[PDB]
Amino acid sequence: PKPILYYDERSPPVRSCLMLIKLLDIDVELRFVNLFKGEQFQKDFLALNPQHSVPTLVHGDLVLTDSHAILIHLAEKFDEGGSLWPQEHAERMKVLNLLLFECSFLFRRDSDFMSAIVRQGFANVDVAHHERKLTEAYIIMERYLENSDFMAGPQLTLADLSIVTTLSTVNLMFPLSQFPRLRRWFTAMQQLDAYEANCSGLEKLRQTMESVGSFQFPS
Amino acid sequence: PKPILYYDERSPPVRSCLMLIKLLDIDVELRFVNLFKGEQFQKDFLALNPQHSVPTLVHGDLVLTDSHAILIHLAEKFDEGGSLWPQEHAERMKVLNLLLFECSFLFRRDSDFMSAIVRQGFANVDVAHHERKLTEAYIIMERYLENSDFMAGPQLTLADLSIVTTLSTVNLMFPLSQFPRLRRWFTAMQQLDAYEANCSGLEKLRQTMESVGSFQFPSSSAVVT
Ligand SMILES: C[C@]12CC[C@@H]3c4ccc(O)cc4CC[C@H]3[C@@H]1CC[C@@H]2O
Ligand SMILES: C[C@]12CC[C@@H]3c4ccc(O)cc4CC[C@H]3[C@@H]1CC[C@@H]2O
Ligand SMILES: N[C@@H](CCC(=O)N[C@@H](CS)C(=O)NCC(=O)O)C(=O)O
Ligand SMILES: N[C@@H](CCC(=O)N[C@@H](CS)C(=O)NCC(=O)O)C(=O)O
Numbered sequence: 001p002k003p004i005l006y007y008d009e010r011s012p013p014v015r016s017c018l019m020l021i022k023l024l025d026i027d028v029e030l031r032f033v034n035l036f037k038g039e040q041f042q043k044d045f046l047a048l049n050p051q052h053s054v055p056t057l058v059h060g061d062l063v064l065t066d067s068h069a070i071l072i073h074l075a076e077k078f079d080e081g082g083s084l085w086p087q088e089h090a091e092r093m094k095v096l097n098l099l100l101f102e103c104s105f106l107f108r109r110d111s112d113f114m115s116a117i118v119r120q121g122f123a124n125v126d127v128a129h130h131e132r133k134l135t136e137a138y139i140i141m142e143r144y145l146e147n148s149d150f151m152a153g154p155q156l157t158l159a160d161l162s163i164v165t166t167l168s169t170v171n172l173m174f175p176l177s178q179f180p181r182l183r184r185w186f187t188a189m190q191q192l193d194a195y196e197a198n199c200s201g202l203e204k205l206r207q208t209m210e211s212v213g214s215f216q217f218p219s
Numbered sequence: 220p221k222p223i224l225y226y227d228e229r230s231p232p233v234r235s236c237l238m239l240i241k242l243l244d245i246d247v248e249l250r251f252v253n254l255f256k257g258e259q260f261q262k263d264f265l266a267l268n269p270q271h272s273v274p275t276l277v278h279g280d281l282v283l284t285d286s287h288a289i290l291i292h293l294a295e296k297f298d299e300g301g302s303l304w305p306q307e308h309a310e311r312m313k314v315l316n317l318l319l320f321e322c323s324f325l326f327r328r329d330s331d332f333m334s335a336i337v338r339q340g341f342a343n344v345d346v347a348h349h350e351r352k353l354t355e356a357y358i359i360m361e362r363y364l365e366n367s368d369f370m371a372g373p374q375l376t377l378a379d380l381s382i383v384t385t386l387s388t389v390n391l392m393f394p395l396s397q398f399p400r401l402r403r404w405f406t407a408m409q410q411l412d413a414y415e416a417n418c419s420g421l422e423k424l425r426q427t428m429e430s431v432g433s434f435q436f437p438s439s440s441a442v443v444t
Contacts, residue, residue, distance in 0.1 A: 050358070050359040050362045050363075051320065051323075051324055051359060061309070062309050062312055062313070063316075064312060064316050065316060065319075065320065066316055066319035066320065066323060068315075068319055069312060069315045069316045069319055072312075072315065073308075073312050076308065077308075089292075089295060089296075090280070090281050093281060093283060093288060093291075093292050094281075096288045096291065097282075097283050097284060097285055097288045100284075100285035100287055100288055100322065101270065101284070101285065103319060103322050103323055104270075104285060104322055105270055108327060139269070140269040140270065143269050144269075
């Protein structure tokens with residue numbers, strides 16, 4: 001049976017999965033879970049995913065509750081022989097390492113900031129603290145790009161799909177003007193056909209955050 | 220060349236790698252990085268791992284900066300064909316899924332709490348807030364174990380090694396009285412010879428945290444056997 005993706009396109013890790021789906025022409029049934037209405041706490045979705053998070057994928061009996069597993073699963077099932085999830089062990093571990101950076105560091109800091117806005121209101125958030133934490137992530141990615149065109153080497157991989165959606169989201173608030181490699185990489189990502197899958201949810205997130213946070217992003 | 224592990228055994232994700240190294244009898248060189256002295260900000264270690272975190276593995280030219288990548292790499296290289304990182308695709312995805320739960324949810328909440336203690340002192344932490352967040356993680360692990368014997372299926376996998384070290388750390392502070400599947404599973408993990416690699420760093424972390432945060436963990440909380 002075809003995969004079912006539970007999603008809210010305001011979520012960057014959702015948008016990474018949407019980008020992979022578009023890149024690989026995957027036939028997926030979409031089911032919208034409105035996070036800002038708390039639908040991720042509805043009894044049946046909670047039973048499916050106790051972490052009450054999107055993206056969640058149901059593919060037959062397999063239930064995945066993390067975008068990075070979903071990216072790897074879909075690449076392994078629908079892109080055997082591709083370069084997104086490379087077959088050679090060392091290259092694959094490098095992609096995996098950067099997927100985990102996205103999970104552990106970049107998204108953690110993005111989510112910490114966005115959560116603070118939703119909970120406290122933008123006027124009551126320590127923006128300087130979060131600017132420091134998120135600029136530290138920019139600095140790391142700029143170094144990651146020193147000897148490669150893409151995040152994990154010379155070719156586009158799953159790591160780029162995972163990072164670019166969160167990066168585009170952090171970049172709602174914090175510009176890339178000071179980071180030449182990161183800005184060039186982001187511009188190149190924006191040229192890919194599959195990047196169109198990021199656009200609608202980024203803008204919906206912008207609009208939702210500004211309304212819920214009572215502020216305007218600088219951009 | 221033999222793998223090199225940059226480590227501070229007080230870190231639960233370090234201890235997960237130590238457990239796998241013991242379980243598989245991998246010969247690894249250990250290089251200590253004292254996180255409470257800020258040695259992870261030394262210029263050469265920062266150049267190696269810009270995230271200034273342990274564990275960090277150097278294996279030949281490969282540099283891994285996340286425990287979950289280290290566990291998977293070492294299982295592929297030293298448990299080839301084995302069941303810790305299982306061969307069938309769906310079983311492997313389940314293990315990967317719970318490795319990411321550890322990274323995204325359980326460890327995130329453990330480190331939010333531990334960092335707050337170190338940065339603020341225990342007396343100035345909103346302990347009730349962190350109790351709610353960490354009990355929520357207990358509830359989720361209890362749900363996974365209501366439907367499966369181990370975290371990711373019927374046998375020991377990398378997911379159990381990743382999760383048990385952080386669970387043992389959270390349980391320094393928060394009791395498991397209300398979580399019978401978690402207690403049964405944790406007890407079984409404690410019977411494994413490989414669990415001996417968790418014990419020393421767990422106790423060092425307890426000692427360090429009590430000192431730096433000026434508090435005592437409730438001795439009654441930790442599951443011991
Ligand atoms: C604010 C929430 C936590 C942080 C989530 C987040 C975190 C990071 C991000 O880039 C986008 C979002 C959108 C949905 C947000 C969630 C909607 C309700 C929930 O509490
Ligand atoms: C407190 C730090 C962040 C949280 C880290 C942590 C986070 C979770 C945990 O179980 C153990 C530790 C030990 C090292 C801690 C770090 C040493 C200094 C750093 O600031
Ligand atoms: N590591 C997870 C993070 C998933 C996550 O945190 N999703 C957020 C949206 S960006 C969510 O669903 N929040 C709802 C909630 O926590 O209640 C992944 O990569 O899928
Ligand atoms: N997701 C990473 C988490 C690594 C991590 O945060 N390690 C902590 C210790 S538990 C660390 O090294 N903190 C030092 C610092 O941030 O400066 C992994 O699994 O390896």
